[PDB]
Amino acid sequence: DVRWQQRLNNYARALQQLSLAVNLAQTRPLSDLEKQGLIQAFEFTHELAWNVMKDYFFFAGNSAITGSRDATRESFNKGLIKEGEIWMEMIKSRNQTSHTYNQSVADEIVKNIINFYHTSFQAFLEKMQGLKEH
Amino acid sequence: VRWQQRLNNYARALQQLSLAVNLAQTRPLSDLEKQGLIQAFEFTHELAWNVMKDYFFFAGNSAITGSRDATRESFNKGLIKEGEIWMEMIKSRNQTSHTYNQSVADEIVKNIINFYHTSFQAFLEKMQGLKEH
Ligand SMILES: [Mg+2]
Numbered sequence A: 001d002v003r004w005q006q007r008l009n010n011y012a013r014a015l016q017q018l019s020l021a022v023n024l025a026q027t028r029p030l031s032d033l034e035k036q037g038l039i040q041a042f043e044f045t046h047e048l049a050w051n052v053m054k055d056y057f058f059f060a061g062n063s064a065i066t067g068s069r070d071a072t073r074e075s076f077n078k079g080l081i082k083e084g085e086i087w088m089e090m091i092k093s094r095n096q097t098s099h100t101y102n103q104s105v106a107d108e109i110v111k112n113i114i115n116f117y118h119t120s121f122q123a124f125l126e127k128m129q130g131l132k133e134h
Numbered sequence B: 001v002r003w004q005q006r007l008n009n010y011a012r013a014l015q016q017l018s019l020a021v022n023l024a025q026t027r028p029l030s031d032l033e034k035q036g037l038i039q040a041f042e043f044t045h046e047l048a049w050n051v052m053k054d055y056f057f058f059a060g061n062s063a064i065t066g067s068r069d070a071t072r073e074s075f076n077k078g079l080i081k082e083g084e085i086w087m088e089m090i091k092s093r094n095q096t097s098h099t100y101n102q103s104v105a106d107e108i109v110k111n112i113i114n115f116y117h118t119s120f121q122a123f124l125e126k127m128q129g130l131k132e133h
Helices: A004-027 A034-057 A068-078 A082-093 A103-133 B003-026 B031-058 B067-079 B083-092 B102-131
Strands: none
Touching: A004 A034, A004 A103, A004 B031, A004 B083, A004 B102, A034 A068, A034 A082, A034 B003, A034 B067, A068 A082, A082 B083, B003 B031, B031 B067, B031 B083, B031 B102, B067 B083, B083 B102
């Protein structure tokens, strides 16, 4: 039923595609359309991240988690993530998705993806990969 | 509460989607650009069905809550004619979390280019005619 290590496998696959786009941005500016794609990749990577969180705490007997905010708070309190505000900012970015046809909105989410979220995603991957081995 | 204002933003969003759909006619899209085409479809469809919901609110219909509700009412009243296509857009929306699978991304992209963009343009013209009354 609930299998947090399988969810982690898909999270890694999604993050690898986000990493491709984040690396591309270091070689040249992204077009407006590529920025929309970077946002889409952030969205499917973040969605998997907090569902890994939810799945992991279900094993611990926690059935009270229902969304990304609940999952992010429990992860911070249990030490799975260190940058609590950044992970909460990700949720704000998710809630701005419908408005990214405004370049100011798209550009803000892209700057956060490149300068903060990707690093946090990689740290969470490494954290959970260690816990799986245990 | 203002369906004509919602329609202004819908047109702005559709203009951005149109740019990507025309780009796809000049060359293949990269994997990343495909993701960006899907994101543009998402913000265009979200505005579309909220225009529907706003419009029917003026008629006294406060029962509409989501995109399926809005889409059915729009088909019932003639605002849209391709009912099955507009419902397929909702299935595409619900696949958004899985577009890191190239098969999923490619399927949504093909639907956007071959069907959804045409339907979006028709709905724009339909509502633009209703704004003039
Ligand atoms: Mg999206």
